[PDB]
PDB file of all heavy atoms in Angstrom:
ATOM      1  N   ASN X   1     151.295  99.129  67.454  1.00 50.14           N
ATOM      2  CA  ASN X   1     150.525  99.347  68.641  1.00 50.14           C
ATOM      3  C   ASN X   1     149.021  99.181  68.350  1.00 50.14           C
ATOM      4  O   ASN X   1     148.296  98.484  69.074  1.00 50.14           O
ATOM      5  CB  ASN X   1     150.815 100.730  69.235  1.00 50.14           C
ATOM      6  CG  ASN X   1     152.275 100.897  69.634  1.00 50.14           C
ATOM      7  OD1 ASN X   1     152.884 101.954  69.353  1.00 50.14           O
ATOM      8  ND2 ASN X   1     152.790  99.889  70.325  1.00 50.14           N
ATOM      9  N   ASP X   2     148.603  99.823  67.256  1.00 49.22           N
ATOM     10  CA  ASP X   2     147.201  99.793  66.875  1.00 49.22           C
ATOM     11  C   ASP X   2     146.728  98.378  66.499  1.00 49.22           C
ATOM     12  O   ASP X   2     145.636  97.947  66.922  1.00 49.22           O
ATOM     13  CB  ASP X   2     146.895 100.780  65.762  1.00 49.22           C
ATOM     14  CG  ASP X   2     145.418 101.174  65.701  1.00 49.22           C
ATOM     15  OD1 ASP X   2     144.651 100.672  66.481  1.00 49.22           O
ATOM     16  OD2 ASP X   2     145.082 101.972  64.769  1.00 49.22           O
ATOM     17  N   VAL X   3     147.578  97.600  65.755  1.00 48.34           N
ATOM     18  CA  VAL X   3     147.159  96.301  65.359  1.00 48.34           C
ATOM     19  C   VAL X   3     147.200  95.343  66.554  1.00 48.34           C
ATOM     20  O   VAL X   3     146.350  94.451  66.583  1.00 48.34           O
ATOM     21  CB  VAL X   3     148.040  95.775  64.219  1.00 48.34           C
ATOM     22  CG1 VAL X   3     147.958  96.718  62.991  1.00 48.34           C
ATOM     23  CG2 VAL X   3     149.460  95.538  64.609  1.00 48.34           C
ATOM     24  N   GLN X   4     148.107  95.512  67.479  1.00 48.57           N
ATOM     25  CA  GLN X   4     148.097  94.723  68.687  1.00 48.57           C
ATOM     26  C   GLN X   4     146.841  95.032  69.525  1.00 48.57           C
ATOM     27  O   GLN X   4     146.191  94.096  70.021  1.00 48.57           O
ATOM     28  CB  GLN X   4     149.313  94.961  69.541  1.00 48.57           C
ATOM     29  CG  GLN X   4     150.590  94.378  68.957  1.00 48.57           C
ATOM     30  CD  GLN X   4     150.621  92.823  69.065  1.00 48.57           C
ATOM     31  OE1 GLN X   4     151.205  92.152  68.229  1.00 48.57           O
ATOM     32  NE2 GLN X   4     149.943  92.348  70.092  1.00 48.57           N
ATOM     33  N   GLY X   5     146.464  96.276  69.624  1.00 51.78           N
ATOM     34  CA  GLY X   5     145.240  96.606  70.350  1.00 51.78           C
ATOM     35  C   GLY X   5     144.019  96.018  69.685  1.00 51.78           C
ATOM     36  O   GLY X   5     143.101  95.500  70.364  1.00 51.78           O
ATOM     37  N   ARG X   6     143.941  96.083  68.352  1.00 51.76           N
ATOM     38  CA  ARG X   6     142.841  95.497  67.624  1.00 51.76           C
ATOM     39  C   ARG X   6     142.760  94.002  67.745  1.00 51.76           C
ATOM     40  O   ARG X   6     141.713  93.379  67.884  1.00 51.76           O
ATOM     41  CB  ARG X   6     142.892  95.937  66.132  1.00 51.76           C
ATOM     42  CG  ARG X   6     142.582  97.389  65.876  1.00 51.76           C
ATOM     43  CD  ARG X   6     142.634  97.749  64.394  1.00 51.76           C
ATOM     44  NE  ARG X   6     144.029  98.005  63.980  1.00 51.76           N
ATOM     45  CZ  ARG X   6     144.414  99.126  63.465  1.00 51.76           C
ATOM     46  NH1 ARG X   6     143.579 100.126  63.251  1.00 51.76           N
ATOM     47  NH2 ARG X   6     145.684  99.230  63.111  1.00 51.76           N
ATOM     48  N   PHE X   7     143.943  93.362  67.699  1.00 52.88           N
ATOM     49  CA  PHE X   7     144.000  91.922  67.909  1.00 52.88           C
ATOM     50  C   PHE X   7     143.516  91.559  69.310  1.00 52.88           C
ATOM     51  O   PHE X   7     142.798  90.500  69.487  1.00 52.88           O
ATOM     52  CB  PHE X   7     145.428  91.380  67.707  1.00 52.88           C
ATOM     53  CG  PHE X   7     145.579  89.922  68.011  1.00 52.88           C
ATOM     54  CD1 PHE X   7     145.161  88.957  67.073  1.00 52.88           C
ATOM     55  CD2 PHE X   7     146.171  89.540  69.144  1.00 52.88           C
ATOM     56  CE1 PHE X   7     145.325  87.618  67.324  1.00 52.88           C
ATOM     57  CE2 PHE X   7     146.342  88.167  69.464  1.00 52.88           C
ATOM     58  CZ  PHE X   7     145.888  87.208  68.546  1.00 52.88           C
ATOM     59  N   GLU X   8     143.924  92.307  70.343  1.00 56.51           N
ATOM     60  CA  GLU X   8     143.454  91.978  71.679  1.00 56.51           C
ATOM     61  C   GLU X   8     141.939  92.169  71.805  1.00 56.51           C
ATOM     62  O   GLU X   8     141.235  91.356  72.370  1.00 56.51           O
ATOM     63  CB  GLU X   8     144.160  92.874  72.671  1.00 56.51           C
ATOM     64  CG  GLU X   8     145.646  92.640  72.799  1.00 56.51           C
ATOM     65  CD  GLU X   8     146.396  93.820  73.471  1.00 56.51           C
ATOM     66  OE1 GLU X   8     146.590  94.862  72.822  1.00 56.51           O
ATOM     67  OE2 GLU X   8     146.830  93.652  74.638  1.00 56.51           O
ATOM     68  N   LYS X   9     141.440  93.224  71.159  1.00 59.31           N
ATOM     69  CA  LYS X   9     139.969  93.449  71.137  1.00 59.31           C
ATOM     70  C   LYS X   9     139.291  92.250  70.462  1.00 59.31           C
ATOM     71  O   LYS X   9     138.255  91.771  70.912  1.00 59.31           O
ATOM     72  CB  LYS X   9     139.622  94.774  70.423  1.00 59.31           C
ATOM     73  CG  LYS X   9     140.104  95.979  71.195  1.00 59.31           C
ATOM     74  CD  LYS X   9     139.947  97.218  70.349  1.00 59.31           C
ATOM     75  CE  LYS X   9     140.405  98.464  71.087  1.00 59.31           C
ATOM     76  NZ  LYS X   9     139.719  98.675  72.377  1.00 59.31           N
ATOM     77  N   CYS X  10     139.849  91.826  69.318  1.00 57.26           N
ATOM     78  CA  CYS X  10     139.153  90.752  68.538  1.00 57.26           C
ATOM     79  C   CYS X  10     139.199  89.445  69.301  1.00 57.26           C
ATOM     80  O   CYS X  10     138.194  88.712  69.331  1.00 57.26           O
ATOM     81  CB  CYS X  10     139.864  90.568  67.170  1.00 57.26           C
ATOM     82  SG  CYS X  10     139.402  91.853  66.002  1.00 57.26           S
ATOM     83  N   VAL X  11     140.312  89.097  69.952  1.00 60.68           N
ATOM     84  CA  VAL X  11     140.366  87.842  70.665  1.00 60.68           C
ATOM     85  C   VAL X  11     139.582  87.873  71.923  1.00 60.68           C
ATOM     86  O   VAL X  11     139.082  86.864  72.500  1.00 60.68           O
ATOM     87  CB  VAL X  11     141.874  87.455  70.953  1.00 60.68           C
ATOM     88  CG1 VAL X  11     142.616  87.275  69.663  1.00 60.68           C
ATOM     89  CG2 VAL X  11     142.545  88.438  71.888  1.00 60.68           C
ATOM     90  N   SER X  12     139.367  89.094  72.529  1.00 63.81           N
ATOM     91  CA  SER X  12     138.510  89.236  73.713  1.00 63.81           C
ATOM     92  C   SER X  12     137.048  89.189  73.316  1.00 63.81           C
ATOM     93  O   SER X  12     136.242  88.660  74.097  1.00 63.81           O
ATOM     94  CB  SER X  12     138.840  90.570  74.409  1.00 63.81           C
ATOM     95  OG  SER X  12     138.540  91.664  73.577  1.00 63.81           O
ATOM     96  N   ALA X  13     136.654  89.682  72.166  1.00 65.42           N
ATOM     97  CA  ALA X  13     135.288  89.788  71.752  1.00 65.42           C
ATOM     98  C   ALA X  13     134.809  88.569  70.888  1.00 65.42           C
ATOM     99  O   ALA X  13     133.599  88.442  70.671  1.00 65.42           O
ATOM    100  CB  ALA X  13     135.026  91.064  71.025  1.00 65.42           C
ATOM    101  N   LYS X  14     135.711  87.702  70.415  1.00 64.90           N
ATOM    102  CA  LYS X  14     135.302  86.606  69.655  1.00 64.90           C
ATOM    103  C   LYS X  14     134.497  85.624  70.482  1.00 64.90           C
ATOM    104  O   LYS X  14     133.441  85.105  69.997  1.00 64.90           O
ATOM    105  CB  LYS X  14     136.494  85.913  68.987  1.00 64.90           C
ATOM    106  CG  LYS X  14     137.598  85.450  70.044  1.00 64.90           C
ATOM    107  CD  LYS X  14     138.658  84.655  69.352  1.00 64.90           C
ATOM    108  CE  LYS X  14     139.443  83.863  70.401  1.00 64.90           C
ATOM    109  NZ  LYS X  14     139.940  84.665  71.570  1.00 64.90           N
ATOM    110  N   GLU X  15     134.958  85.412  71.707  1.00 66.20           N
ATOM    111  CA  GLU X  15     134.182  84.517  72.576  1.00 66.20           C
ATOM    112  C   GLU X  15     132.811  85.116  72.905  1.00 66.20           C
ATOM    113  O   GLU X  15     131.806  84.418  72.923  1.00 66.20           O
ATOM    114  CB  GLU X  15     134.950  84.245  73.925  1.00 66.20           C
ATOM    115  CG  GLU X  15     136.371  83.803  73.628  1.00 66.20           C
ATOM    116  CD  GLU X  15     137.229  84.063  74.923  1.00 66.20           C
ATOM    117  OE1 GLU X  15     136.699  84.649  75.898  1.00 66.20           O
ATOM    118  OE2 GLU X  15     138.367  83.670  74.870  1.00 66.20           O
ATOM    119  N   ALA X  16     132.748  86.400  73.168  1.00 66.42           N
ATOM    120  CA  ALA X  16     131.453  87.091  73.443  1.00 66.42           C
ATOM    121  C   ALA X  16     130.561  87.013  72.291  1.00 66.42           C
ATOM    122  O   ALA X  16     129.345  86.711  72.454  1.00 66.42           O
ATOM    123  CB  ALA X  16     131.723  88.524  73.883  1.00 66.42           C
ATOM    124  N   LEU X  17     131.045  87.219  71.056  1.00 65.15           N
ATOM    125  CA  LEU X  17     130.160  87.200  69.869  1.00 65.15           C
ATOM    126  C   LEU X  17     129.708  85.762  69.609  1.00 65.15           C
ATOM    127  O   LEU X  17     128.561  85.539  69.230  1.00 65.15           O
ATOM    128  CB  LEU X  17     130.875  87.780  68.664  1.00 65.15           C
ATOM    129  CG  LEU X  17     130.138  87.807  67.342  1.00 65.15           C
ATOM    130  CD1 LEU X  17     128.756  88.399  67.535  1.00 65.15           C
ATOM    131  CD2 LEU X  17     130.935  88.461  66.268  1.00 65.15           C
ATOM    132  N   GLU X  18     130.616  84.783  69.753  1.00 67.40           N
ATOM    133  CA  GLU X  18     130.205  83.415  69.611  1.00 67.40           C
ATOM    134  C   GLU X  18     129.136  83.005  70.661  1.00 67.40           C
ATOM    135  O   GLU X  18     128.226  82.302  70.289  1.00 67.40           O
ATOM    136  CB  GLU X  18     131.383  82.465  69.646  1.00 67.40           C
ATOM    137  CG  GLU X  18     131.783  81.979  70.987  1.00 67.40           C
ATOM    138  CD  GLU X  18     133.146  81.259  70.946  1.00 67.40           C
ATOM    139  OE1 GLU X  18     133.832  81.391  69.952  1.00 67.40           O
ATOM    140  OE2 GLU X  18     133.509  80.671  72.017  1.00 67.40           O
ATOM    141  N   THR X  19     129.280  83.483  71.823  1.00 65.98           N
ATOM    142  CA  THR X  19     128.258  83.188  72.831  1.00 65.98           C
ATOM    143  C   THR X  19     126.929  83.822  72.525  1.00 65.98           C
ATOM    144  O   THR X  19     125.870  83.318  72.757  1.00 65.98           O
ATOM    145  CB  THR X  19     128.706  83.609  74.230  1.00 65.98           C
ATOM    146  OG1 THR X  19     130.039  83.042  74.505  1.00 65.98           O
ATOM    147  CG2 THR X  19     127.809  83.127  75.306  1.00 65.98           C
ATOM    148  N   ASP X  20     127.014  85.102  71.989  1.00 65.73           N
ATOM    149  CA  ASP X  20     125.789  85.792  71.567  1.00 65.73           C
ATOM    150  C   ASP X  20     125.109  85.010  70.456  1.00 65.73           C
ATOM    151  O   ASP X  20     123.878  84.806  70.473  1.00 65.73           O
ATOM    152  CB  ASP X  20     126.112  87.217  71.066  1.00 65.73           C
ATOM    153  CG  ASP X  20     124.903  88.069  70.871  1.00 65.73           C
ATOM    154  OD1 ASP X  20     123.808  87.590  71.136  1.00 65.73           O
ATOM    155  OD2 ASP X  20     125.101  89.237  70.449  1.00 65.73           O
ATOM    156  N   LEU X  21     125.862  84.510  69.496  1.00 66.89           N
ATOM    157  CA  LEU X  21     125.309  83.672  68.444  1.00 66.89           C
ATOM    158  C   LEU X  21     124.700  82.425  69.048  1.00 66.89           C
ATOM    159  O   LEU X  21     123.605  81.987  68.617  1.00 66.89           O
ATOM    160  CB  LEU X  21     126.308  83.339  67.382  1.00 66.89           C
ATOM    161  CG  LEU X  21     126.705  84.506  66.466  1.00 66.89           C
ATOM    162  CD1 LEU X  21     127.701  84.020  65.396  1.00 66.89           C
ATOM    163  CD2 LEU X  21     125.506  85.114  65.858  1.00 66.89           C
ATOM    164  N   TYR X  22     125.408  81.770  69.940  1.00 69.56           N
ATOM    165  CA  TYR X  22     124.893  80.599  70.611  1.00 69.56           C
ATOM    166  C   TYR X  22     123.543  80.797  71.267  1.00 69.56           C
ATOM    167  O   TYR X  22     122.601  80.041  71.085  1.00 69.56           O
ATOM    168  CB  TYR X  22     125.907  80.069  71.624  1.00 69.56           C
ATOM    169  CG  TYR X  22     127.231  79.672  71.063  1.00 69.56           C
ATOM    170  CD1 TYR X  22     128.341  79.649  71.809  1.00 69.56           C
ATOM    171  CD2 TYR X  22     127.380  79.258  69.734  1.00 69.56           C
ATOM    172  CE1 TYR X  22     129.582  79.299  71.343  1.00 69.56           C
ATOM    173  CE2 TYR X  22     128.550  78.948  69.199  1.00 69.56           C
ATOM    174  CZ  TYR X  22     129.680  78.888  70.038  1.00 69.56           C
ATOM    175  OH  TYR X  22     130.925  78.534  69.479  1.00 69.56           O
ATOM    176  N   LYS X  23     123.472  81.912  72.074  1.00 74.66           N
ATOM    177  CA  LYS X  23     122.234  82.206  72.809  1.00 74.66           C
ATOM    178  C   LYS X  23     121.115  82.596  71.860  1.00 74.66           C
ATOM    179  O   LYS X  23     119.955  82.259  72.072  1.00 74.66           O
ATOM    180  CB  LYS X  23     122.472  83.324  73.824  1.00 74.66           C
ATOM    181  CG  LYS X  23     123.340  82.860  74.974  1.00 74.66           C
ATOM    182  CD  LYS X  23     123.453  83.922  76.053  1.00 74.66           C
ATOM    183  CE  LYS X  23     123.864  85.237  75.488  1.00 74.66           C
ATOM    184  NZ  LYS X  23     125.200  85.176  74.798  1.00 74.66           N
ATOM    185  N   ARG X  24     121.452  83.342  70.791  1.00 73.91           N
ATOM    186  CA  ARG X  24     120.389  83.671  69.778  1.00 73.91           C
ATOM    187  C   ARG X  24     119.854  82.433  69.097  1.00 73.91           C
ATOM    188  O   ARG X  24     118.645  82.265  68.984  1.00 73.91           O
ATOM    189  CB  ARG X  24     120.998  84.632  68.753  1.00 73.91           C
ATOM    190  CG  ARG X  24     120.964  86.105  69.215  1.00 73.91           C
ATOM    191  CD  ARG X  24     121.813  87.007  68.315  1.00 73.91           C
ATOM    192  NE  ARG X  24     121.596  88.403  68.527  1.00 73.91           N
ATOM    193  CZ  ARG X  24     122.251  89.390  67.983  1.00 73.91           C
ATOM    194  NH1 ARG X  24     123.239  89.164  67.147  1.00 73.91           N
ATOM    195  NH2 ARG X  24     121.896  90.666  68.248  1.00 73.91           N
ATOM    196  N   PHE X  25     120.730  81.520  68.684  1.00 74.88           N
ATOM    197  CA  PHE X  25     120.272  80.265  68.097  1.00 74.88           C
ATOM    198  C   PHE X  25     119.459  79.446  69.123  1.00 74.88           C
ATOM    199  O   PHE X  25     118.486  78.825  68.728  1.00 74.88           O
ATOM    200  CB  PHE X  25     121.462  79.448  67.661  1.00 74.88           C
ATOM    201  CG  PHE X  25     122.311  80.160  66.625  1.00 74.88           C
ATOM    202  CD1 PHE X  25     123.681  79.831  66.449  1.00 74.88           C
ATOM    203  CD2 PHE X  25     121.837  81.143  65.805  1.00 74.88           C
ATOM    204  CE1 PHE X  25     124.458  80.514  65.539  1.00 74.88           C
ATOM    205  CE2 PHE X  25     122.575  81.782  64.901  1.00 74.88           C
ATOM    206  CZ  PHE X  25     123.898  81.484  64.743  1.00 74.88           C
ATOM    207  N   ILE X  26     119.886  79.465  70.356  1.00 76.61           N
ATOM    208  CA  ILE X  26     119.198  78.688  71.399  1.00 76.61           C
ATOM    209  C   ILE X  26     117.735  79.268  71.599  1.00 76.61           C
ATOM    210  O   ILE X  26     116.803  78.522  71.679  1.00 76.61           O
ATOM    211  CB  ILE X  26     119.957  78.703  72.711  1.00 76.61           C
ATOM    212  CG1 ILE X  26     121.135  77.761  72.640  1.00 76.61           C
ATOM    213  CG2 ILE X  26     119.022  78.348  73.904  1.00 76.61           C
ATOM    214  CD1 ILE X  26     122.093  77.890  73.815  1.00 76.61           C
ATOM    215  N   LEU X  27     117.631  80.568  71.621  1.00 76.06           N
ATOM    216  CA  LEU X  27     116.284  81.171  71.821  1.00 76.06           C
ATOM    217  C   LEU X  27     115.436  80.959  70.596  1.00 76.06           C
ATOM    218  O   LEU X  27     114.180  80.704  70.742  1.00 76.06           O
ATOM    219  CB  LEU X  27     116.381  82.702  72.146  1.00 76.06           C
ATOM    220  CG  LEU X  27     116.823  83.666  71.191  1.00 76.06           C
ATOM    221  CD1 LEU X  27     115.679  84.275  70.351  1.00 76.06           C
ATOM    222  CD2 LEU X  27     117.636  84.785  71.819  1.00 76.06           C
ATOM    223  N   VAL X  28     116.021  81.019  69.413  1.00 78.65           N
ATOM    224  CA  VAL X  28     115.228  80.704  68.206  1.00 78.65           C
ATOM    225  C   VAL X  28     114.765  79.261  68.217  1.00 78.65           C
ATOM    226  O   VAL X  28     113.612  78.943  67.888  1.00 78.65           O
ATOM    227  CB  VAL X  28     116.046  81.056  66.959  1.00 78.65           C
ATOM    228  CG1 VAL X  28     115.291  80.551  65.702  1.00 78.65           C
ATOM    229  CG2 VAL X  28     116.319  82.560  66.846  1.00 78.65           C
ATOM    230  N   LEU X  29     115.623  78.335  68.607  1.00 75.78           N
ATOM    231  CA  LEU X  29     115.266  76.986  68.649  1.00 75.78           C
ATOM    232  C   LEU X  29     114.180  76.720  69.722  1.00 75.78           C
ATOM    233  O   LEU X  29     113.332  75.909  69.576  1.00 75.78           O
ATOM    234  CB  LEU X  29     116.458  76.085  68.901  1.00 75.78           C
ATOM    235  CG  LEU X  29     117.436  76.041  67.704  1.00 75.78           C
ATOM    236  CD1 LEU X  29     118.452  74.885  67.861  1.00 75.78           C
ATOM    237  CD2 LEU X  29     116.682  75.885  66.380  1.00 75.78           C
ATOM    238  N   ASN X  30     114.292  77.478  70.848  1.00 77.09           N
ATOM    239  CA  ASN X  30     113.319  77.320  71.900  1.00 77.09           C
ATOM    240  C   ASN X  30     111.974  77.825  71.499  1.00 77.09           C
ATOM    241  O   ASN X  30     110.988  77.171  71.845  1.00 77.09           O
ATOM    242  CB  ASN X  30     113.825  78.069  73.179  1.00 77.09           C
ATOM    243  CG  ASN X  30     114.970  77.375  73.823  1.00 77.09           C
ATOM    244  OD1 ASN X  30     115.579  76.433  73.251  1.00 77.09           O
ATOM    245  ND2 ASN X  30     115.319  77.842  74.994  1.00 77.09           N
ATOM    246  N   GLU X  31     111.884  78.946  70.807  1.00 73.78           N
ATOM    247  CA  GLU X  31     110.619  79.416  70.273  1.00 73.78           C
ATOM    248  C   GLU X  31     110.107  78.468  69.262  1.00 73.78           C
ATOM    249  O   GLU X  31     108.859  78.336  69.123  1.00 73.78           O
ATOM    250  CB  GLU X  31     110.703  80.856  69.844  1.00 73.78           C
ATOM    251  CG  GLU X  31     111.579  81.063  68.580  1.00 73.78           C
ATOM    252  CD  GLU X  31     111.732  82.505  68.189  1.00 73.78           C
ATOM    253  OE1 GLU X  31     111.163  83.402  68.914  1.00 73.78           O
ATOM    254  OE2 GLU X  31     112.397  82.764  67.173  1.00 73.78           O
ATOM    255  N   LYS X  32     110.962  77.913  68.427  1.00 77.26           N
ATOM    256  CA  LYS X  32     110.510  76.908  67.434  1.00 77.26           C
ATOM    257  C   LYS X  32     109.908  75.703  68.176  1.00 77.26           C
ATOM    258  O   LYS X  32     108.888  75.155  67.782  1.00 77.26           O
ATOM    259  CB  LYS X  32     111.680  76.509  66.553  1.00 77.26           C
ATOM    260  CG  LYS X  32     111.866  77.339  65.321  1.00 77.26           C
ATOM    261  CD  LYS X  32     110.572  77.457  64.577  1.00 77.26           C
ATOM    262  CE  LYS X  32     110.701  78.395  63.331  1.00 77.26           C
ATOM    263  NZ  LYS X  32     109.401  79.097  63.104  1.00 77.26           N
ATOM    264  N   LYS X  33     110.559  75.282  69.241  1.00 77.29           N
ATOM    265  CA  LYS X  33     109.998  74.160  70.036  1.00 77.29           C
ATOM    266  C   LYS X  33     108.648  74.497  70.632  1.00 77.29           C
ATOM    267  O   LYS X  33     107.805  73.697  70.721  1.00 77.29           O
ATOM    268  CB  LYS X  33     110.989  73.754  71.148  1.00 77.29           C
ATOM    269  CG  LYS X  33     112.291  73.180  70.655  1.00 77.29           C
ATOM    270  CD  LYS X  33     113.178  72.772  71.788  1.00 77.29           C
ATOM    271  CE  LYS X  33     114.660  72.827  71.419  1.00 77.29           C
ATOM    272  NZ  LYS X  33     115.191  74.190  71.434  1.00 77.29           N
ATOM    273  N   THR X  34     108.530  75.753  71.099  1.00 79.07           N
ATOM    274  CA  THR X  34     107.212  76.246  71.602  1.00 79.07           C
ATOM    275  C   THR X  34     106.121  76.252  70.572  1.00 79.07           C
ATOM    276  O   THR X  34     105.006  75.828  70.789  1.00 79.07           O
ATOM    277  CB  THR X  34     107.392  77.642  72.196  1.00 79.07           C
ATOM    278  OG1 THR X  34     108.527  77.661  73.058  1.00 79.07           O
ATOM    279  CG2 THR X  34     106.174  77.943  73.073  1.00 79.07           C
ATOM    280  N   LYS X  35     106.514  76.650  69.290  1.00 80.26           N
ATOM    281  CA  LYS X  35     105.585  76.620  68.233  1.00 80.26           C
ATOM    282  C   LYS X  35     105.196  75.157  67.896  1.00 80.26           C
ATOM    283  O   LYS X  35     104.002  74.850  67.662  1.00 80.26           O
ATOM    284  CB  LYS X  35     106.206  77.244  66.982  1.00 80.26           C
ATOM    285  CG  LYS X  35     105.212  77.348  65.772  1.00 80.26           C
ATOM    286  CD  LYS X  35     104.065  78.267  66.076  1.00 80.26           C
ATOM    287  CE  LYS X  35     103.171  78.349  64.853  1.00 80.26           C
ATOM    288  NZ  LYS X  35     103.855  79.160  63.777  1.00 80.26           N
ATOM    289  N   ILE X  36     106.148  74.246  67.889  1.00 78.60           N
ATOM    290  CA  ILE X  36     105.854  72.826  67.711  1.00 78.60           C
ATOM    291  C   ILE X  36     104.917  72.306  68.821  1.00 78.60           C
ATOM    292  O   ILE X  36     104.022  71.513  68.529  1.00 78.60           O
ATOM    293  CB  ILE X  36     107.166  72.004  67.597  1.00 78.60           C
ATOM    294  CG1 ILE X  36     108.011  72.449  66.382  1.00 78.60           C
ATOM    295  CG2 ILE X  36     106.858  70.509  67.479  1.00 78.60           C
ATOM    296  CD1 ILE X  36     107.299  72.272  65.066  1.00 78.60           C
ATOM    297  N   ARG X  37     105.170  72.730  70.071  1.00 79.02           N
ATOM    298  CA  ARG X  37     104.345  72.284  71.181  1.00 79.02           C
ATOM    299  C   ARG X  37     102.919  72.751  70.970  1.00 79.02           C
ATOM    300  O   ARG X  37     101.990  72.007  71.204  1.00 79.02           O
ATOM    301  CB  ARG X  37     104.951  72.803  72.472  1.00 79.02           C
ATOM    302  CG  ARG X  37     105.948  71.901  73.157  1.00 79.02           C
ATOM    303  CD  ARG X  37     106.536  72.594  74.371  1.00 79.02           C
ATOM    304  NE  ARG X  37     107.421  73.699  73.954  1.00 79.02           N
ATOM    305  CZ  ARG X  37     108.271  74.295  74.735  1.00 79.02           C
ATOM    306  NH1 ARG X  37     108.460  73.880  75.983  1.00 79.02           N
ATOM    307  NH2 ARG X  37     109.066  75.318  74.309  1.00 79.02           N
ATOM    308  N   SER X  38     102.742  74.031  70.606  1.00 81.91           N
ATOM    309  CA  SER X  38     101.475  74.608  70.380  1.00 81.91           C
ATOM    310  C   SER X  38     100.732  73.871  69.232  1.00 81.91           C
ATOM    311  O   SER X  38      99.486  73.566  69.326  1.00 81.91           O
ATOM    312  CB  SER X  38     101.548  76.084  70.112  1.00 81.91           C
ATOM    313  OG  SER X  38     102.203  76.300  68.932  1.00 81.91           O
ATOM    314  N   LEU X  39     101.463  73.579  68.137  1.00 81.35           N
ATOM    315  CA  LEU X  39     100.826  72.856  67.050  1.00 81.35           C
ATOM    316  C   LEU X  39     100.429  71.493  67.444  1.00 81.35           C
ATOM    317  O   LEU X  39      99.383  70.929  67.055  1.00 81.35           O
ATOM    318  CB  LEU X  39     101.821  72.799  65.901  1.00 81.35           C
ATOM    319  CG  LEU X  39     101.768  74.048  64.924  1.00 81.35           C
ATOM    320  CD1 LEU X  39     102.849  73.924  63.864  1.00 81.35           C
ATOM    321  CD2 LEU X  39     100.383  74.121  64.301  1.00 81.35           C
TER     322      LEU X  39
END
């Protein structure tokens, strides 16, 4: 029961965490682009 619950949590949150990483990388690249624009 516990491992099934943990597996469900992991498969539900893997997409959310990957999207969080995607957006964090996107914002870092956007601020890098802004720095390049300013330079």
Side-chain angles (χ1 to χ4, degrees):
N1 299 135
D2 202 0
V3 302
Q4 287 289 150
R6 289 181 277 239
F7 175 78
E8 294 162 287
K9 294 172 180 300
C10 282
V11 302
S12 62
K14 55 174 200 309
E15 312 160 353
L17 178 53
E18 90 192 8
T19 308
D20 191 2
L21 286 184
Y22 297 157
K23 292 187 307 299
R24 276 167 167 175
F25 302 154
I26 285 169
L27 70 91
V28 172
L29 293 192
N30 289 11
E31 67 184 1
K32 273 306 178 212
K33 293 182 207 79
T34 314
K35 185 65 178 291
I36 298 298
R37 271 174 290 195
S38 64
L39 273 177

